[PDB]
Each structure stands twice: as structure tokens, then as C-alpha cells.
């Protein structure tokens, strides 16, 4: 059949850029999603580094989360030095079914609005 322009996998919600901290948080805090819906915003001063927001549905009152993903040349990305992955997507694969210490395993990358 026809060739589609740019064979897409995701590149929406989970894989985001350097949106403001409160912006990425605005999309998770929405009642449209829940704990596991994430944002992986970039560090705008990054050495290939990212960051990550998660909807923490705690007893305090629906707060996001914040993590520090450093991009390794020899290990892709790491948040906890114990858990490293060759790329964020391998990080977002494992976390989907088992957050593994993130206290919030992924579910659905926010609410696609485009």
C-alpha cells in the first residue's frame, strides 16, 4: 500500500520535550487520566538528559511527581542508578507493567490532544 509520512510508534505524551514543569503537570493532574500517565520532558540545558512527571494519587491530594533521567553513553537512561535502560523507551516499556520503584507504573500516556 501507500507509504505513510513518518512511521509513528508513539512520540505523544510519554515522549515530550522541555515543556514547563507546571505544564507537563497540568496534563497529568487532569481528571482525564490517572497514576501511570506520564510526561518525559527534556532538560533545556541537557547533555541528552530528560525529566519525568507522574500523576501521584496520594492521600494528600492528587500531586504529580518529578524524576531525573540522565542519559548515559554507556547505559541509555537512569533514574535510579540500580535501574538503567538503553533508551527511555525501554524504561517506558518496563515501567508500563511494572513501575519498579517509581511508585506509579505507567498506564496511559496522558490524554492525546492534537
Swiss-Prot record:
Tissue and organ distribution: Expressed in immature Vgamma2 gamma-delta T-cells (at protein level). Expressed in the B-cell lineage.
Location of this chain's protein in the cell: Cell membrane
Subunit structure: Interacts with CBL (via SH2 domain). Interacts with CD79A and CD79B (via SH2 domain).
Family statement drawn from the similarity comment of this UniProt entry: Belongs to the protein kinase superfamily. Tyr protein kinase family. SRC subfamily.
Residue spans crossing the bilayer: none
Highest taxon of source: Eukaryota
Organism: Mus musculus
Protein name per its UniProtKB record: Tyrosine-protein kinase Blk
Conditions for induction: Expression increases during B-cell differentiation and is under the control of the B-cell specific transcription factors PAX5 and NF-kappa-B.
Function statement: Non-receptor tyrosine kinase involved in B-lymphocyte development, differentiation and signaling. B-cell receptor (BCR) signaling requires a tight regulation of several protein tyrosine kinases and phosphatases, and associated coreceptors. Binding of antigen to the B-cell antigen receptor (BCR) triggers signaling that ultimately leads to B-cell activation. Signaling through BLK plays an important role in transmitting signals through surface immunoglobulins and supports the pro-B to pre-B transition, as well as the signaling for growth arrest and apoptosis downstream of B-cell receptor.
PTM per Swiss-Prot/TrEMBL: Phosphorylated on tyrosine residues after antibody-mediated surface engagement of the B-cell antigen receptor (BCR). Ubiquitination of activated BLK by the UBE3A ubiquitin protein ligase leads to its degradation by the ubiquitin-proteasome pathway.
Boundaries of the shown chain within the full protein: 105 to 218 of 499
Domain SH2, residue spans: 14-110
Amino acid at each position: 500500500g501507500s507509504v505513510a509520512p513518518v512511521e509513528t510508534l508513539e512520540v505523544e505524551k510519554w515522549f515530550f520535550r522541555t515543556i514547563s514543569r507546571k505544564d507537563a503537570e497540568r496534563q497529568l493532574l487532569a481528571p482525564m487520566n490517572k497514576a501511570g500517565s506520564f510526561l518525559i520532558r527534556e532538560s533545556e540545558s541537557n547533555k541528552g538528559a530528560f525529566s519525568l512527571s507522574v500523576k501521584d494519587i496520594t492521600t494528600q491530594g492528587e500531586v504529580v511527581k518529578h524524576y531525573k533521567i540522565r542519559s548515559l553513553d554507556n547505559g541509555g537512561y537512569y533514574i535510579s542508578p540500580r535501574i538503567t535502560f538503553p533508551t527511555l523507551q525501554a524504561l517506558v516499556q518496563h515501567y508500563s507493567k511494572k513501575g519498579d520503584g517509581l511508585c506509579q507504573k505507567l498506564t496511559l500516556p496522558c490524554v492525546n490532544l492534537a
